[PDB]
Amino acid sequence: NECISVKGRIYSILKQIGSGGSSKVFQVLNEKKQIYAIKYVNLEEADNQTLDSYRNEIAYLNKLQQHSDKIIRLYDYEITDQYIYMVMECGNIDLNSWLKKKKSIDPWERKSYWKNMLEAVHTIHQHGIVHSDLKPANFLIVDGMLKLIDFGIANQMQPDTTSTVNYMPPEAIKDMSISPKSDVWSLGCILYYMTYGKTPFQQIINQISKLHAIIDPNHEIEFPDIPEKDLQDVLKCCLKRDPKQRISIPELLAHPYVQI
Numbered sequence: 713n714e715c716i717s718v719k720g721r722i723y724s725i726l727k728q729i730g731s732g733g734s735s736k737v738f739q740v741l742n743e744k745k746q747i748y749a750i751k752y753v754n755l756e757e758a759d760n761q762t763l764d765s766y767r768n769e770i771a772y773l774n775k776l777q778q779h780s781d782k783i784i785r786l787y788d789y790e791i792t793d794q795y796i797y798m799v800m801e802c803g804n805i806d807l808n809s810w811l812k813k814k815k816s817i818d819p820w821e822r823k824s825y826w827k828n829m830l831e832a833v834h835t836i837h838q839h840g841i842v843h844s845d846l847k848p849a850n851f852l853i854v855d856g857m858l859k860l861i862d863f864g865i866a867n868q869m870q871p872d873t874t875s876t877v878n879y880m881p882p883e884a885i886k887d888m889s890i891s892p893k894s895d896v897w898s899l900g901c902i903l904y905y906m907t908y909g910k911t912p913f914q915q916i917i918n919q920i921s922k923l924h925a926i927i928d929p930n931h932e933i934e935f936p937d938i939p940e941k942d943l944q945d946v947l948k949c950c951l952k953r954d955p956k957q958r959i960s961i962p963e964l965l966a967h968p969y970v971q972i
């Protein structure tokens with residue numbers, strides 16, 4: 713029975729659902745037995761940039777509440793020199809853990825999910841945020857709706873329970889020596905996964921070879937034929953290596969796959 717107070721409200725810890733570094737995530741209950749997620753960061757051991765990255769994510773999360781329900785809700789928060797508590801809506805499971813259950817995916821639900829994702833990413837792009845880290849774990853399933861969790865700004869924690877370079881756009885790699893199109897590529901890999909059960913480059917074990925294959929236009933991404941030909945078209949337009957050629961999000965919003 714470990715509790716937490718945030719802005720004068722007590723929450724009881726059900727379990728820890730993720731942790732890393734100076735930070736933790738818990739499922740909690742208020743006194744009315746309503747469930748929430750609480751994200752905790754210990755600033756006492758936090759570094760400086762962790763601090764500013766964490767102030768930026770919180771402000772953006774707050775600003776964007778009004779604009780989309782495909783962004784996770786921040787109900788309240790507390791910041792001190794010592795700690796951060798963030799009280800957020802609690803979801804059922806993240807999209808990465810659910811895809812690992814290896815079950816059939818309803819093509820109708822795959823497209824409903826794809827829609828939610830596009831809506832959430834489109835919303836952050838409208839405010840000038842390009843996520844750059846998009847992965848299934850950035851998405852939370854709440855009442856059959858996908859909701860975006862983070863903005864890619866603050867660093868990450870790692871999931872806990874009681875029981876990857878794969879999404880990297882070729883631009884990012886050549887950049888070793890940023891476009892909203894970067895998110896399209898990553899989103900593309902995610903839809904690719906909900907379609908073919910694997911990521912485009914997943915097969916390559918050696919990470920050097922894999923980073924090369926992503927940037928090598930002579931490396932052909934497979935697109936097996938499937939009942940939905942328009943989905944197949946979405947995959948191909950998301951997965952073009954040339955960001956200028958790659959489809960944008962507002963176009964993806966108008967595509968037959970989500971509109972029909």
Ligand SMILES: CC[C@@H](NC(=O)c1ccc2[nH]nc(-c3ccc(OC4CCN(C)CC4)cc3)c2c1)c1ccccc1Cl
Pocket residue numbers: 729730731737749751784800801802803804805806809849850852861862867868869870871872873
């Ligand atoms: C692990 C850190 C990670 N997640 C969060 O920050 C975060 C924030 C708000 C949230 N509301 N609900 C969740 C959530 C609830 C359930 C859930 O799945 C459960 C628990 C774990 N297992 C293995 C399956 C069943 C997953 C999430 C929630 C999570 C994080 C994610 C993206 C970007 C940054 C960070 Cl720190």
